[PDB]
Amino acid sequence: GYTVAVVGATGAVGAQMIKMLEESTLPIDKIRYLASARSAGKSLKFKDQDITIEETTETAFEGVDIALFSAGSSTSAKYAPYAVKAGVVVVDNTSYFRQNPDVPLVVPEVNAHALDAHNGIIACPNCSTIQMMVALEPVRQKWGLDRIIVSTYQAVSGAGMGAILETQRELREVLNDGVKPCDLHAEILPSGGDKKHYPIAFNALPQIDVFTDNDYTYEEMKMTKETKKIMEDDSIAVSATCVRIPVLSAHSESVYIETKEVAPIEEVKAAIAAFPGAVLEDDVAHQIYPQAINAVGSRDTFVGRIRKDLDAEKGIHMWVVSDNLLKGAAWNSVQIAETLHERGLVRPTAELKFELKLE
Amino acid sequence: GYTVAVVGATGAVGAQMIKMLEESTLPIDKIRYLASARSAGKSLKFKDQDITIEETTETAFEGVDIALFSAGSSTSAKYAPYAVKAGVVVVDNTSYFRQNPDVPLVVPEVNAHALDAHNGIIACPNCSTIQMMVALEPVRQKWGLDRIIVSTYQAVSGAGMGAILETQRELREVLNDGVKPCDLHAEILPSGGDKKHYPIAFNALPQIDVFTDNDYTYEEMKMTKETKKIMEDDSIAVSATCVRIPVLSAHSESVYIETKEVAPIEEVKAAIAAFPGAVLEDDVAHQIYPQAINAVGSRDTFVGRIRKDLDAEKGIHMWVVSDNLLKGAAWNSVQIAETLHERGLVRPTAELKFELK
Ligand SMILES: NC(=O)c1ccc[n+]([C@@H]2O[C@H](COP(=O)([O-])OP(=O)(O)OC[C@H]3O[C@@H](n4cnc5c(N)ncnc54)[C@H](OP(=O)(O)O)[C@@H]3O)[C@@H](O)[C@H]2O)c1
Ligand SMILES: NC(=O)c1ccc[n+]([C@@H]2O[C@H](COP(=O)([O-])OP(=O)(O)OC[C@H]3O[C@@H](n4cnc5c(N)ncnc54)[C@H](OP(=O)(O)O)[C@@H]3O)[C@@H](O)[C@H]2O)c1
Numbered sequence: 074g075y076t077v078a079v080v081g082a083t084g085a086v087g088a089q090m091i092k093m094l095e096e097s098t099l100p101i102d103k104i105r106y107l108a109s110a111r112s113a114g115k116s117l118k119f120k121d122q123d124i125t126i127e128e129t130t131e132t133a134f135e136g137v138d139i140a141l142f143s144a145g146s147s148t149s150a151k152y153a154p155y156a157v158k159a160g161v162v163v164v165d166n167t168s169y170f171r172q173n174p175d176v177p178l179v180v181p182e183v184n185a186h187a188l189d190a191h192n193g194i195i196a197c198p199n200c201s202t203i204q205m206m207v208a209l210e211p212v213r214q215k216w217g218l219d220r221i222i223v224s225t226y227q228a229v230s231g232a233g234m235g236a237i238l239e240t241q242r243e244l245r246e247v248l249n250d251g252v253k254p255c256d257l258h259a260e261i262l263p264s265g266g267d268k269k270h271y272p273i274a275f276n277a278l279p280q281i282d283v284f285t286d287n288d289y290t291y292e293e294m295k296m297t298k299e300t301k302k303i304m305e306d307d308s309i310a311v312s313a314t315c316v317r318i319p320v321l322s323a324h325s326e327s328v329y330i331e332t333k334e335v336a337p338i339e340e341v342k343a344a345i346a347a348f349p350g351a352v353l354e355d356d357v358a359h360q361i362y363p364q365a366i367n368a369v370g371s372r373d374t375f376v377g378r379i380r381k382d383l384d385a386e387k388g389i390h391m392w393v394v395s396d397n398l399l400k401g402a403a404w405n406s407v408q409i410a411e412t413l414h415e416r417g418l419v420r421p422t423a424e425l426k427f428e429l430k431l432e
Numbered sequence: 433g434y435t436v437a438v439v440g441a442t443g444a445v446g447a448q449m450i451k452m453l454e455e456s457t458l459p460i461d462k463i464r465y466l467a468s469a470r471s472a473g474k475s476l477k478f479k480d481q482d483i484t485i486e487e488t489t490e491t492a493f494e495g496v497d498i499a500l501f502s503a504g505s506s507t508s509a510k511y512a513p514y515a516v517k518a519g520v521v522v523v524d525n526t527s528y529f530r531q532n533p534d535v536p537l538v539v540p541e542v543n544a545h546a547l548d549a550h551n552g553i554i555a556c557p558n559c560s561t562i563q564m565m566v567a568l569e570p571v572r573q574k575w576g577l578d579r580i581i582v583s584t585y586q587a588v589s590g591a592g593m594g595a596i597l598e599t600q601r602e603l604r605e606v607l608n609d610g611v612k613p614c615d616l617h618a619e620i621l622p623s624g625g626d627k628k629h630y631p632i633a634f635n636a637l638p639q640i641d642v643f644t645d646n647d648y649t650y651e652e653m654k655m656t657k658e659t660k661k662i663m664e665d666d667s668i669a670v671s672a673t674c675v676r677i678p679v680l681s682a683h684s685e686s687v688y689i690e691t692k693e694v695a696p697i698e699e700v701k702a703a704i705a706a707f708p709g710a711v712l713e714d715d716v717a718h719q720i721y722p723q724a725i726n727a728v729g730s731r732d733t734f735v736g737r738i739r740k741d742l743d744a745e746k747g748i749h750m751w752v753v754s755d756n757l758l759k760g761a762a763w764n765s766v767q768i769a770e771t772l773h774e775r776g777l778v779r780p781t782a783e784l785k786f787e788l789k
């Protein structure tokens with residue numbers, strides 16, 4: 074079996090990494106939980122076992138076979154290259170390594186083939202990108218993709234445990250204390266790192282991550298760039314609007330595509346139904362469509378409201394929902410580790426291709 | 433001055449109709465509040481005066497100059513034609529008369545000219561359409577519009593007083609009693625009249641109104657058909673996805689357009705800023721963009737996140753927010769009434785074009 078380390082074990086994604094590993098088929102001989110100095114020495118369960126949390130350091134990875142990182146980009150930048158140097162295979166949930174040509178950016182149902190040539194780091198894409206890829210890959214395979222326009226409806230757990238707590242607190246102040254949403258004080262959302270913070274309670278914030286120099290946010294540009302890499306087609310036009318709404322878990326997306334060939338809607342429904350990891354929930358006569366509250370706790374990606382554009386011959390609209398902590402993060406990561414195991418790819422990488430940041 | 437009647441005075445829109453009338457310049461000599469039989473006899477304020485609510489009937493409109501209807505499509509279908517026969521000018525918030533070619537479908541900043549030929553009924557468009565029209569008209573004027581794709585983020589007050597209470601109760605049950613959202617009981621949302629009801633707490637429901645034959649909902653199809661009528665151009669391609677989210681007041685919209693000619697983004701921002709009823713809130717360097725919570729209580733429509741598409745030469749994205757009970761309903765109606773006053777259009781219609789009953 075394997076020694077598996079979870080880096081960022083105490084966070085929103087980490088708690089789901091634990092759950093997904095507890096439910097995994099991976100043969101695990103030893104579990105280690107790593108986080109910051111803040112959590113070092115505390116205890117968390119793995120099944121019935123008590124695991125002492127360790128501070129993440131450059132020397133923490135000896136004997137580790139697989140390390141799952143979900144502790145922020147700076148933590149992956151600082152420590153994943155040392156883990157690789159030590160002989161680990163890293164599955165990274167952060168954005169840091171996603172666009173590195175030496176790093177596979179993987180959704181196992183879409184581009185598992187990319188895992189074979191890994192160099193010790195496999196990156197999980199952005200949560201909003203992953204579920205979109207599950208929905209759209211079966212369509213691309215049969216009718217091609219020319220462009221995508223997507224507007225997202227993103228849950229706050231996307232921004233971490235602090236953001237969940239902020240949202241719950243804000244809602245309680247409004248609903249129990251009678252505070253006006255405009256009078257709420259926020260510390261984290263829309264973006265922990267940015268300069269100004271706004272209430273999410275009873276609001277919709279059209280900012281996820283920070284702004285880039287083209288006036289799209291980093292979240293929007295990640296959807297664009299990650300789609301192109303995952304589908305191995307730079308010619309797919311993708312523009313996004315990413316919005317935070319008052320949902321704790323599960324992202325929803327209004328997705329418009331134009332295909333290369335006309336894709337009959339009944340065939341599109343069938344293709345998605347048949348695609349691993351995607352579930353068709355589309356029966357408007359009985360008001361059946363994906364819903365965030367129904368998707369929570371499931372590894373599947375749910376697709377419905379599928380219909381042709383009213384004017385563009387090759388245009389199709391749909392609604393895509395998945396638990397952003399599961400398929401959008403921890404489940405994609407554990408699924409990657411399981412796929413690495415299936416393919417005999419859990420072993421050290423001889424040549425280091427990633428800069429060491431702590432020399 | 434005028435005798436003004438508010439039909440549906442007790443509802444979500446009705447309450448805001450009262451507020452907009454209280455704050456109006458309209459010369460009002462007499463105000464009357466009308467609702468259903470179960471509200472008759474109750475008292476409701478107009479400024480400091482106490483107004484006794486009356487039951488809406490076929491005979492209730494004698495001596496009324498202007499009637500603002502916000503009491504459900506059934507109530508407008510039933511009583512609006514009797515109001516017209518009685519010499520009233522009706523401004524209707526319902527969907528009932530919107531697609532009747534004898535009825536102007538008006539956003540005053542966009543198509544006030546359509547008021548001149550009214551036949552006693554003027555229809556207010558759907559809330560989600562109105563704010564989109566305010567944002568897009570200044571762009572259309574300068575560079576034209578080829579197509580629109582919109583995804584909405586609609587507040588629960590759009591579905592009436594009951595939907596607000598249901599939303600608040602559901603959120604309390606989750607936050608205070610630890611109920612899982614998927615286990616909540618719902619009676620109204622997504623659509624009061626439809627067969628099944630779902631929780632909105634911590635959810636996003638991609639259904640507003642009921643489904644039509646083409647698998648778009650009536651709300652989505654209204655955005656399509658109403659846009660074409662208001663902008664007087666059936667060639668504009670419009671497809672919508674309309675979604676309810678856990679917001680009490682103010683609708684937000686992610687709007688994509690392609691113009692007929694390339695519209696430089698700085699000029700687009702300037703054109704929107706200069707357009708009556710639209711306010712530019714777009715300064716990403718300081719994280720400035722329209723927000724539902726900031727728009728509540730304002731008659732203005734706020735536009736930001738304006739940026740060109742990453743690939744389509746003529747494509748532009750933006751974010752549009754307005755209070756759905758104000759510009760989306762009660763303010764659009766009162767603004768129509770003020771515009772009718774300005775234009776000398778508050779008078780009986782000689783020829784009746786609307787079937788009684
Ligand atoms: N949430 C999502 O839907 C989502 C989806 C895809 C990807 N991701 C990515 O996954 C990562 C984790 O996000 P989250 O939502 O789980 O955040 P979170 O709840 O705020 O948790 C952050 C975690 O990072 C750890 N950490 C912080 N600084 C550290 C350091 N210097 N060394 C080691 N550990 C450190 C924290 O440990 P302490 O408790 O000791 O502070 C905690 O375990 C982020 O990079 C995020 O971009 C998140
Ligand atoms: N809410 C919005 O953002 C929005 C936007 C645009 C248009 N609209 C339209 O405006 C209308 C009202 O919506 P709302 O949200 O204000 O609904 P609401 O809160 O449920 O209020 C319904 C109102 O209609 C009255 N009513 C019901 N049946 C009646 C009858 N038979 N005769 C006279 N009055 C009757 C009710 O009076 P009682 O109290 O006596 O029952 C109440 O005043 C609807 O047609 C809706 O489509 C709403």
Ligand SMILES: Nc1cc(C(=O)O)ccc1C(=O)O
Pocket residue numbers: 166167168198199200227228230231232233281282292295
């Ligand atoms: N800003 C984010 C970035 C990522 C990522 O790229 O890992 C995941 C979630 C969020 C969020 O805040 O919802």
Ligand code: NA
Pocket residue numbers: 704705706707708709710711712
């Ligand atoms: Na203006």
